[PDB]
Design a binder for this molecule. Structure first.
Ligand SMILES: *[C@@H]1O[C@H](CO)[C@@H](O[C@@H]2O[C@H](CO)[C@@H](O)[C@H](O)[C@H]2NC(C)=O)[C@H](O)[C@H]1NC(C)=O
Ligand SMILES: *[C@@H]1O[C@H](CO)[C@@H](O[C@@H]2O[C@H](CO)[C@@H](O)[C@H](O)[C@H]2NC(C)=O)[C@H](O)[C@H]1NC(C)=O
Ligand code: CA
Ligand code: CA
Ligand code: CA
Ligand code: CA
Ligand code: CA
Ligand code: CA
Ligand code: CA
Ligand code: CA
Lengths: 296, 4, 285, 54, 4, 292, 303, 67, 4, 4
């Protein structure tokens, strides 16, 4: 009578088979790569705010040269939101890109900056990408820079976290972050940690002041010996983890939103999280970070 | 998440 | 059977976890972008060819006076000549009714294959064209709605600084079947027609920055940015009219505003394709 | 205790499917295409409640 | 064109 | 008897008869000396061509008078050509150097010319408008205009203009150039910012102005600039460069001297104040390739 | 009671001493003139910028002052110099002949008469153009070609030594070419000098009068008899005797190309051959009066 | 005995003719000197004095009406 | 000069 | 004059 097991295991054995088949098909498709054709805008400048001053009114891929030392590089500029001039630094919206990478890729920048708009001969749609801590550092040290973080849940509600001051130190200082001057509606995860937590439980979730960590480079605020126990594999991305997070924009992209300890690879809240808005087991549909020069 |  | 079917699939799994690891390694690189920028630079596109570039496409150039480099589209003929292209029309996909700022900085897109319309900006045209005593030559290439083509070369072509409103000037027409439209045209309505439609010496105008010789606003009434003069006989930043032939009725203010070159075709005819490119003059004979 | 293990492998299996779905969708950024698929979890939920009763 |  | 006398008389009479016959062959020698007219220092060279450069192309090596016949022209006419050591031949159409010619002339006179041409360039004149029109629009080879000025201290300065052209009479001998090509005399043709009016510079510029004279007003003034300044020029309400103005000795002059109160001298505002009139002026054209 | 005062008549020697002295003055005078002719006179005639076919067209083109201009009557020909009278009777007159000071000899042959000789103009006091006409003959070929382009009037003016002046206007003047010996034709007389060319001398009657008529005569020069004096003695020619090349008949009633006598009145015993060879206009002052000024001007007429 | 009647009464006849030759020659010279003015660097200023010639001729007629 |  |  309690042979409703087989029921089970038959499954498991069947399940496996279907998994293998899908893995198999994805492998065949990976024999050929995706391609894009991003014709470059004539107008260029040191960052997206100079480009909108120079007449580039449309949101699309641009080349910027924040500095003559450096070679011009590609970026998505958002010219619509809040009066435009925002340089996209990070963007999540469809799961297309793996963010679980090591230090080097986080240093260099990874992903697709932009992709072709249905008809058109320019890439007017951002892809999922990480600009690269070196680039992020240099852009934030040019002068006062604000930070806009926008997110959207799987039902279309959307919130924003605006940071009047944002800086990222250089590699030697392990990309230490600094943010201040908050306003918005997601809550202030970066400066106050998780509104759900109490006492020191909350302060260990603050990001302001942290260094960047990757699964191959522990700089987190969790002082401990078990190598397995590092905020960064137990959380997926490259981030300014503390012990460990209130927000994890670079986490894994769970389809649908709601996830669980038993879906997470190692059992923690490793999704695209912003605990102050939807707590830990909710992975956002969209998430992005944009920056823009500030004033004086 | 914090580490309890 | 019993414990059976349990360790089947339960064995496939460890091996499944490993196929997965191969998939992950197959999925780290970004989509491959067909558009690439070459790594040869120079003062201009001729300088890039003299350095061995052997192919048309996108390069960065850094004129002598410029304090930052910039992306240009070079035309490398297999003859060793490198042309810097600053203007290009081929379909009416880009709106050329743009303001001062846009004409100064540039608008449109640069493509490796040259299948993109654009206006390099005015400031750029200025920096290349006056960076040294080596005179430049301008070559205009036109193409009608019947695949015929023609050209017009100008020698010592220069564009002035912004303080002088990016005034155009050339020493003389160097020939071509397209005819010297920059010299003005006798529309035959008034003895001064030809002088009022000539271009040599004109400042640039846009709707928001009238520097024309018309009581009114040529760029506002024709919809483009050009070296206007009460108003024009050669107009390549004009409205793109499909078909070539167009009429006053199709125009917005009743004046010819298409891509004309009155010494090759009538002002009621708009070109199919347009190219404006420059090369150091010694390159021509 | 055998229920025990199907216990564990059940979990092991639920995470693996979830990992494969994140990994296949992460190939939409590199390969000519990504397989459209949906993870049917409930089948797993239902399937594990049914191991509670027991 | 011209401006008559 | 005193016949000794009748002797010496026949003596004297026969002598004076022979004196006469010889005297007469001497008048005959004189007369052949007095048949030629006075020598005129002014000669006209024999080479011809489209313009002076063309003359110079054909080996003409000296400045002076020659006839030319522009392609458009239906009758050759005399011009003064300045040919340098290097082979340039300028066609001079204007010259001022002492105040001997009155430049207050009517439309006709400005159209046909007035003044004199000299082998030595030591004479004032206006080539006429029609001629400057036929020479400068004869072929698509663009000409440049060179304005030379000389102050009362010996100083000289120049001003060049590219693609210089004078329109037909149907368009009132409209002046046009493409741009100023440089010179230390500065570009008065571009108008001058004399003072407070913000529209100074627009109203005193000359590119595109039709020519005007007292009897044929084509200026941009509700009055008559040319009639008020006494000259023939491409007036614009009214001017900032005026080489056909009144000739004032010593250069400095003041509104008191003037007849209407306005500056009517041989002025080139960008080089000296409108109340200072030039000593000499020269206006001359050359195929622009001669300066490329 | 015989040779009375014969001694007394040595009022000869008085004479002959003189003649001998006069011949010496005359030999130095010619000799001083001959030394002055080692150097020619010179002029500097800067050319007026305006030009035309003839003085009429120049005045229509704005050339208001009387001075030397260059005209080109016809493109076959080379432009040449002329003095243009722009003040008399409306201006536009091309001077063809001008006498006013004796500075030019008119006794020339056919050739010089054909080509033209003398001074077209001279430099006015301190000016850099030639504003004063000199004494000249423009040239029969050139006179011919001017008169055949179209109807041409003729204006002849003269003035005496006392300041009085008169004029003879001819509304038709034409001079045929060299093959027709430059025959002359004039009509439509008017003025105050009388009609010497058409009617001959008014002092004479019948056929004497008619033999002084000029109208219809051919041109003569002393090396070229075309006169109306049928005769075989070579010395007996009108132009050898009355001194210029002219349209002589037998011989004249007017002799504008004759000899310039200073002061006007002259007598048969002052003339080379004893005839009236002065600058004469019989109809106004007879044959023994020489004008201080005489000129010939022309201008296209109307149709 | 009279050898000197017909000898004079004729020599006077020839001086009369010499007198007319001279006055004419004087006049021709004046005319040819004045026409050098239109040719030579300068012309000699001079006036013919013909009264001196008429008086002299009159003074020779007196002498005749005798024989 | 200029004429106002 | 004339000549008879
Ligand atoms: C930080 O976490 C503690 C955990 O100790 C929270 O409450 C405790 O939860 C632990 C779990 O490990 C339980 O064993 C205890 O029941 C709780 N501890 C006590 C003292 O009862 C607590 O909410 C957080 N700290 C603060 C200051 O709130
Ligand atoms: C015509 O002229 C001749 C002069 O040559 C005149 O004929 C006569 O001249 C002879 C001498 O040769 C004399 O018989 C007469 O005295 C002349 N007549 C007169 C009155 O002069 C002829 O008479 C002249 N007729 C006129 C009126 O001139
Ligand atoms: Ca990964
Ligand atoms: Ca750690
Ligand atoms: Ca016209
Ligand atoms: Ca305007
Ligand atoms: Ca002003
Ligand atoms: Ca006016
Ligand atoms: Ca003689
Ligand atoms: Ca005879």
């Amino acid at each position: 009578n309690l042979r409703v097991l087989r029921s089970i295991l038959e499954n498991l054995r069947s399940k496996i088979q279907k998994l293998e088949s899908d893995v198999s098909a994805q492998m065949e498709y990976c024999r050929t790569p995706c391609t894009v054709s991003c014709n470059i805008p004539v107008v260029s400048g040191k960052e997206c705010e100079e480009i909108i001053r120079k007449g580039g009114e449309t949101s699309e891929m641009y080349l910027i040269q924040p500095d003559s030392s450096v070679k011009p590089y590609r970026v998505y500029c958002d010219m619509n939101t809040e009066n435009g001039g925002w340089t996209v630094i990070q963007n999540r919206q469809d799961g297309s890109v793996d963010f679980g990478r090591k230090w080097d890729p986080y240093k260099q920048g990874f992903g697709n900056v932009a992709t072709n708009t249905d008809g058109k001969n320019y890439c007017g749609l951002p892809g999922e990408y990480w600009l690269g801590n070196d680039k992020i550092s240099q852009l934030t040290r040019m002068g006062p820079t604000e930070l806009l973080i926008e997110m959207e849940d799987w039902k279309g509600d959307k919130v924003k976290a605006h940071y009047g001051g944002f800086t990222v130190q250089n590699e030697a200082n392990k990309y230490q972050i600094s943010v201040n001057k908050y306003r918005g509606t997601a809550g202030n995860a970066l400066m106050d940690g998780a509104s759900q937590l109490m006492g020191e439980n909350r302060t260990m979730t603050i990001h302001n002041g942290m260094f960047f960590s990757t699964y191959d480079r522990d700089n987190d605020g969790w002082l401990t010996s078990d190598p397995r126990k590092q905020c960064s594999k137990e959380d997926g991305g490259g981030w300014w983890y503390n012990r460990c997070h209130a927000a994890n924009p670079n986490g894994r992209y769970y389809w649908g939103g709601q996830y669980t300890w038993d879906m997470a690879k190692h059992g923690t809240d490793d999704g695209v999280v912003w605990m102050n808005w939807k707590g830990s087991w909710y992975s956002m549909r969209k998430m992005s970070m944009k920056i823009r020069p500030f004033f004086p | 998440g914090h580490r309890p | 059977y019993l414990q059976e079917i349990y360790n089947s699939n339960n064995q496939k799994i460890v091996n499944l976890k490993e196929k997965v690891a191969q998939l992950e390694a197959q999925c780290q690189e970004p989509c491959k972008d067909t558009v690439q920028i070459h790594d040869i630079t120079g003062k201009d596109c001729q300088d890039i060819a003299n350095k061995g570039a052997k192919q048309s496409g996108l390069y960065f150039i850094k004129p002598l006076k410029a304090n930052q480099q910039f992306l240009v589209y070079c035309e490398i003929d297999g003859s060793g000549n490198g042309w810097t292209v600053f203007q290009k029309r081929l379909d009416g996909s880009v709106d050329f009714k743009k303001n001062w700022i846009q004409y100064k900085e540039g608008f449109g897109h640069l493509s490796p294959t040259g299948t993109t319309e654009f206006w390099l900006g005015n400031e750029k045209i200025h920096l290349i064209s006056t960076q040294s005593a080596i005179p430049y030559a301008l070559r205009v290439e036109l193409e009608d709605w019947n695949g015929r083509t023609s050209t017009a070369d100008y020698a010592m072509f220069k564009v002035g600084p912004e303080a002088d409103k990016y005034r155009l000037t050339y020493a003389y027409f160097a020939g071509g079947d397209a005819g010297d439209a920059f010299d003005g045209f006798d529309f035959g309505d008034d003895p001064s027609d030809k002088f009022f439609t000539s271009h040599n010496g004109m400042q640039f105008s846009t709707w928001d920055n009238d520097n024309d010789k018309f009581e009114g606003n040529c760029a506002e009434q024709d919809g483009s940015g050009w070296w206007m003069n009460k108003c024009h006989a050669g107009h390549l930043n004009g409205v793109y009219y499909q078909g070539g032939t167009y009429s006053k009725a199709s125009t917005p203010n009743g004046y010819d505003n298409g891509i004309i070159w009155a010494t090759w075709k009538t002002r009621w005819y708009s070109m199919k394709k347009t190219t404006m490119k420059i090369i150091p003059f010694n390159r021509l004979t | 205790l055998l229920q025990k293990n199907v216990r564990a492998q059940l979990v092991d299996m639920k995470r693996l499917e979830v990992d494969i779905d994140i990994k296949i969708r992460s190939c939409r950024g590199s390969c000519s295409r990504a397989l459209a698929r949906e993870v049917d979890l409930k089948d797993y939920e239902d399937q594990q409640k049914q191991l509670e009763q027991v």
